[PDB]
Amino acid sequence: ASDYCKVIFPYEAQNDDELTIKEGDIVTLINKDCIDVGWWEGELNGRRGVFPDNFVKLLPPLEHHHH
């Protein structure tokens, strides 16, 4: 039952704990409760980290059939 969000603004990680996200990226949301107010933890294409929560848009959980 994984949550997903779509990146609306890009963000380049500035330390080890951040996640670099590009516009259009579909990020797996891991945790909304992080040490920093306004930041979420996510996973993307093998990496993981925190990003600002208003750089992204929550998606409906609907997914087309896969192979």
Author numbering: -2 to -1, 270 to 328, 1 to 6
Sentences from the paper on this structure:
CMS, also known as CD2AP (CD2 associated protein), shares overall domain organization with CIN85, containing three SH3 (Src-Homology) domains, a proline-rich region and a coiled-coiled domain, and high sequence identity and hence, it has been assumed to belong to the same family of ubiquitously expressed adaptor molecules and elicit similar biological functions. Recently, SH3 domains were identified as a new class of UBDs. In the current work, we have performed structural and mutational analysis of the three SH3 domains of CD2AP and the third SH3 domain of CIN85.
Interestingly, our NMR titrations suggest significantly tighter binding as well as different areas affected in ubiquitin upon binding compared to those previously reported by Forman-Kay and co-workers using non-tagged ubiquitin. Furthermore, the ubiquitin areas targeted in this work are very similar to the CD2AP SH3-C titration. Although it was stated that this mutant abolishes ubiquitin binding due to the replacement of the key Phe322 residue as in Sla1 SH3-3, we observed binding with a similar affinity to that observed for the wild type form, indicating that CIN85 SH3-C displays a comparable behaviour to CD2AP SH3-C towards ubiquitin binding. Bigger differences are observed within the n-Src loop.
